[PDB]
């Protein structure tokens, strides 16, 4: 399991635009509860929690805090029993 608490910024001259952009981004991240890691559409980043702190500085800190997790699988395989054979005696 790989977890990342990724924070996001939104800069703009119009602060109401910052609020609107953060609102739509949050709603998108919530209603679509995962994000495509790559265009192959095999990996995914299932959301855990998205939180905005409007008081936080626009440039240094960043308004929106999101936590994503992903579950890998250890990449190991082995030989397979395609064919089985045996004889009978007494």
């Amino acid at each position: 399991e790989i977890t990342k608490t990724m924070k996001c910024h939104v800069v703009s001259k119009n602060k109401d635009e910052i609020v609107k952009l953060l609102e739509t981004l949050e709603t998108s991240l919530i209603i679509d509860k995962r994000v495509r890691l790559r265009e192959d559409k095999n990996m995914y980043l299932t959301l855990v929690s998205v939180v905005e702190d409007r008081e936080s500085d626009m440039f240094t800190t960043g308004q929106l805090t999101a936590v994503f997790k992903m579950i890998g699988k250890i990449k190991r395989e082995g030989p397979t029993m395609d064919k089985i054979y045996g004889n009978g005696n007494l």
Binding site: K15, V19, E26, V50
Partner: protein, 91 residues
């Protein structure tokens, strides 16, 4: 317009002999020099500011002060937002 706010006084009550005078510096300040809108895209802040204005019959400013605020007044703002997908259909 603007609205000065009292903040204090100069370091001491100076005396200037060459000018034959005494002086004292009162210290004021002004708020939100760059804000001119008093609007928001936070629907919740709009709703509660409307509620405060109706209930209380005073000004009700949105997310940030404006330089010409009319005392007495209120200001409603959002500090923290937490979204949560409680269910498949509900958020």
């Amino acid at each position: 317009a603007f609205t000065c706010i009292y903040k204090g006084t100069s370091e001491n009550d100076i005396v200037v002999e060459e000018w034959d005078a005494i002086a004292r510096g009162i210290r004021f300040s002004v708020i939100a020099l760059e804000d001119k809108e008093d609007t928001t895209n936070d629907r919740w802040v709009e709703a509660l500011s409307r509620h405060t204005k109706d209930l209380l019959e005073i000004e009700s400013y949105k997310d940030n002060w404006k330089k010409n605020f009319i005392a007495p007044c209120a200001l409603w703002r959002t500090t923290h937002i937490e979204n949560k997908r409680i269910n498949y259909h509900l958020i």
